[PDB]
Design a protein around this nucleic acid. Structure first.
Lengths: 56, 110, 14, 142, 150, 103, 117
RNA sequence: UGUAACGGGGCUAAACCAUGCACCGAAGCUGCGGCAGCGACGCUUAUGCGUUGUUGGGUAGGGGAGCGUUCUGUAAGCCUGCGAAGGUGUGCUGUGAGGCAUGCUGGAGGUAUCAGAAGUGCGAAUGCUGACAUAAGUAACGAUAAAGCGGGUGAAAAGCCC
RNA sequence: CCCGGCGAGGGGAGUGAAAAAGAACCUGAAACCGUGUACGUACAAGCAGUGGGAGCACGCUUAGGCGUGUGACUGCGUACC
């Protein structure tokens, strides 16, 4: 548990090298409205596959 | 291009905000908005607010037509740390840190 | 801290 | 003035063929290590690989004096529970004949990246045929 | 130091260093190991050494053309303008007015001037005979200095 | 064309017309020097030695500079024995220019 | 009077970290490691000002031996022939001849063989 | 714990004996140039030597000579709002502690030479005070009585209201 | 004036010699954390240096060596008190 000595800035950087988040960068275009949304998700106004699926 | 947009004393640690800010480096501005819209971080919304402030600054005081605009130099460098006292076992005390972060966005049209 | 406790006894080894 | 220092671009290397049939193992291996190190060139630099390429055909036909054919043991450790493997000269010739010349050159080369770089010059084979005839390796007698 | 000699924590058991009191010079809110005292800095000189030093500095002011022996030296009215004009007529700027008869007429109108100082012939000092550029003496002051130094 | 001579107790292989750094002599700034200390004269027909000071060879050099070398910090230190010494040293030299290689 | 040791400490620390600039890790930023590193580099420089002479001299011997075995003679008999021929040429310049111009070095090898026989 | 009682490759001489010639091999010696100390010396003289000999690894310790900071006298003198200190780099320079000049910030102070007094030079004392790393975005988010849906306020509602 | 929540915070404008003087405020060192440029590094073992040293990118006068940074490889070197 208790360390012998502290690691480096280099060790911290090589540890956090795999902590880089990945963006999706795959935003889709709706058929009717054309608003930006994710894959298999509805829009902010409830559009999905052109049909008003939320009815709200 | 000048007219930078900084954000002093953000209420989050500089590391996670920096990991959010590593997504957009030289990307398009509308693409940066599209990334920060669906990025599931509180720091993503907190830097999207600063990015929209930079867009409004760019279209207000200087060389607009956001269609030709790029987010060049974003960097998040740590700020002051508020001192707090957290009681622990055996009577001893530990001192947690309320960490802040300065978030400077340098946007350019050329 | 204001109060530093008595440490934890060790292996007997007497 | 400042002395001469060779450059890795300016070294003009040459291909060679050395016959190993009927030769003493250690003397031929020391000569091969000397030629792969580059101690015959007058432009030799201890940090610049100036050695030449050597093709050694008929590596299985090398001979040793005395009783070293049935007594000289090639020890190597696998890095495991403690099962040490061993192999004699007769066992190594009959299975992997390049490894005799390879270990006999490698033990005479210095450790490090430069020793492994001058070790890549070595082009031993078991038979008389070599597929490097497009570079014209001349016969290097010893 | 205002504060008690209480130990801040125990001698043993703690992971920190040794601690006897807060007043120790290696601690904060406290200080100097060997503090200074209101001591006397005046050191003793001999009578003959001081008189020989006065003889030596007068013999030096002779050979440097800085000693100007004049006649009776007095100002008419208590005005600094008159003494300034009289020293301007004698081409004198940084002088030590050293007379043998300390009158009120010269002691009043010489105090505001920086480079002009009026001392008594008995209570002379070496630093004014060396520091000031010229030393102008009255002949009666020369007689009194010759009598005092002997 | 290249010659070999001793200047300051060490040999130097020189070509005609280059600036050579060597050890400081008792020579003025605008004074030229001669070297009867030649050890080899080389050409298309090489002149070798069996004796020094071969036949008549003399190299005429022109003294250019009397500068001092780079500062070298000699740092003595003996561990766990309470001792260290610090001493700098610049080295006097002389840059000369060769004006001819005589045969 | 109270003397504040502020500016001279800055001067000494910057004087040490100027020489220790370019070191890995905390050997160029932490003064406690940098001063240590300057001392050890001074020891290494004082050792290497003789070991440079050692390494270049044995390198010159290696160059002369390599070119002599290229011309077909061992090193010891070659230096023996040059000693019998009273040749005062050092290892540095003779190795420099042996690298570039093979004709003069070949004539010098022939002279060493003539003085040896 | 693995060859593991030539360093290793390996060697029937690349082992040993007797003999010889060379080479390698220290910071030892010599060659070059420079600094410091000691006693004599040609005779120069409050001063370097045409020269000569010799010394110069060093703890505890002794002797000698210097550098840097504050303040005082010198000094109501000098520089200075066309730019002082502190900070920050570069380039010279002394055997050395350091000094000199200058690019940038800064904004009104610093001090030549010679003497004096030190709270006079930090790497350590499980040294103290303040700040920031490290472990690390890791444990944990504090009784395993339990939340699910809709509407409302709001920039945002699992925790706010019904 | 604009973004942002009739927030916090920021950017223009203006006051001001100066806002590289914004109430966290004269000057703002180091430790620590980055951003932008140059070089090296994903077959290579160790007080991470020193000496040699190929290559690369920047600048000077020259019509070529230096100035400075990285420094592959290589001999030696197992921190301070």
């Amino acid at each position: 548990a208790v360390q012998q000595n502290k690691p480096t800035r280099s060790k911290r950087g090589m540890r956090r090298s795999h902590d880089a988040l990945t963006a999706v960068t795959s935003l889709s275009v709706d058929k009717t409205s054309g608003e930006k949304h994710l894959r298999h998700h509805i829009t902010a106004d409830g559009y999905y596959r052109g049909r008003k699926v939320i009815a709200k | 291009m000048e007219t930078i947009a900084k954000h002093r004393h953000a209420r989050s640690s500089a590391q996670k905000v920096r990991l959010v800010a590593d997504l957009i480096r030289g990307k398009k501005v509308s693409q940066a908005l599209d990334i920060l819209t669906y990025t599931n971080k509180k720091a993503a919304v907190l830097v999207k607010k600063v990015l929209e402030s930079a867009i409004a600054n760019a279209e207000h005081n200087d060389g607009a037509d956001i269609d030709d605009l790029k987010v060049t130099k974003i960097f998040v460098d740590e700020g002051p740390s508020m001192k707090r006292i957290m009681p622990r076992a055996k009577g001893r005390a530990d001192r947690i840190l309320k960490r802040t972060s300065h978030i400077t966005v340098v946007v350019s049209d050329r | 801290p204001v109060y530093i406790p008595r440490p934890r006894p060790p292996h007997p080894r007497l | 003035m400042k002395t001469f220092t060779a450059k890795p671009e300016t070294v003009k290397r040459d291909w060679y063929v050395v016959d190993a049939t009927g030769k003493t193992l250690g003397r031929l291996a020391t000569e091969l290590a000397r030629r792969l190190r580059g101690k015959h060139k007058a432009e030799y630099t201890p940090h610049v690989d100036t050695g030449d390429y050597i093709i050694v055909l008929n590596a299985d036909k090398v001979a040793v004096t005395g009783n070293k054919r049935t007594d000289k043991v090639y020890y190597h450790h696998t890095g495991h529970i403690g099962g040490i493997k061993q192999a004699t000269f007769e066992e190594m010739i009959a299975r992997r004949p390049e490894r005799v010349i390879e270990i006999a050159v490698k033990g005479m080369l210095p450790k490090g990246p430069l020793g492994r770089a001058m070790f890549r010059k070595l082009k031993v084979y078991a038979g008389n045929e070599h597929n490097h005839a497009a570079q014209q390796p001349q016969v290097l007698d010893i | 130091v205002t504060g008690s000699g209480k130990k801040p924590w125990r001698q043993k058991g703690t992971g920190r260093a040794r601690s006897g009191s807060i007043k120790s010079p290696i601690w904060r809110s406290g200080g100097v190991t060997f503090a200074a005292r209101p001591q006397d800095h005046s050191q003793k000189v001999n009578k003959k050494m001081y008189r020989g030093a006065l003889k030596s500095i007068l013999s030096e002011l002779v050979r440097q053309d800085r000693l100007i022996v004049v006649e009776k030296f007095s100002v008419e009215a208590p005005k600094t303008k008159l003494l300034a004009q009289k020293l301007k007529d004698m081409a004198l700027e940084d002088v030590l007015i050293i007379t043998g008869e300390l009158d009120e007429n010269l002691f009043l109108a010489a105090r505001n001037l920086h480079k002009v100082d009026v001392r008594d012939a008995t209570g002379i000092d070496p630093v004014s005979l060396i520091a000031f550029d010229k030393v102008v003496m009255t002949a009666d002051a020369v007689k009194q200095v010759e009598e005092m130094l002997a | 064309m290249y010659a070999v001579f001793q200047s300051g107790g060490k040999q130097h292989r020189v070509s005609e017309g280059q600036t050579v750094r060597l050890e400081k002599l008792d020579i003025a700034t605008g004074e030229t020097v001669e070297f009867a200390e030649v050890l080899m004269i080389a050409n298309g027909e090489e002149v070798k030695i069996g004796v020094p000071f071969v036949d008549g060879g003399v190299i005429k050099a022109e003294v250019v500079a009397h500068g001092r070398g780079e500062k070298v910090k000699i740092v003595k230190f003996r561990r766990r024995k309470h001792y260290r010494k610090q001493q700098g040293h610049r080295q006097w030299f002389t840059d000369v220019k060769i004006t001819g290689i005589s045969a | 009077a109270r003397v504040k040791r502020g500016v001279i400490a800055r001067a000494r620390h910057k004087k040490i970290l100027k020489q220790a600039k370019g070191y890995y890790g905390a050997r160029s930023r932490v003064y406690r490691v940098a001063f240590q590193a300057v001392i050890k580099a001074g020891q290494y420089a004082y050792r290497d000002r003789r070991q440079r002479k050692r390494q270049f001299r044995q390198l010159w011997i290696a160059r002369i031996n390599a070119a002599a075995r290229q011309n077909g003679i061992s090193y010891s008999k070659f230096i023996n022939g040059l000693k019998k021929a009273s040749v005062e040429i050092d290892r540095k310049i003779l190795a420099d001849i042996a690298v570039f111009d093979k004709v003069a070095f070949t004539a010098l090898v022939e002279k060493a063989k003539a003085a040896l026989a």
